[PDB]
Amino acid sequence: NIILRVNEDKSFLRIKDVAKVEIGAEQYNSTGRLNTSAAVPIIINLQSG
C-alpha cells in the first residue's frame, strides 16, 4: 500500500500495482544437508587461547 503516485483522479498508484511483495530471504543460493536431509549448518570457531 505504499503510494508511488496519485493519478489526479483521486486514485492512488501503489506498489501492489507494479510489484509483488513478500517476506523472502536476503540470499537464496547457499544450502546445507545433514545425511541427505536439509539442515542449517552452524560453524562454530574456537577463540584463540
Partner 1 sequence: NKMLELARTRKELANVRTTLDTSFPQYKLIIDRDKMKYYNLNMQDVFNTI
Partner 2 sequence: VTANDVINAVNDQNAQYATGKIGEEPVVNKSPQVISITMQGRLQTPQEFE
> Which residues are near partner 2 by CB under 8 A?
24, 28-29
Cα–Cα distance list, 49 to 8, 42, 44, 46 (Å): 68, 21, 15, 8
Q: Residue 20 CB, nearest distance to partner 1 (Å)?
A: 20
Cα–Cα distance list, 26 to 2, 12, 29, 30 (Å): 21, 29, 10, 11
By beta-carbon proximity to partner 2, the closer residue of 3 and 18 is 18
Tell whether residue 6 is a contact of partner 1 (CB under 8 A). Answer: yes
Task: Tell me which residues touch partner 1 (CB under 8 A).
Answer: 1, 3, 6, 10, 12
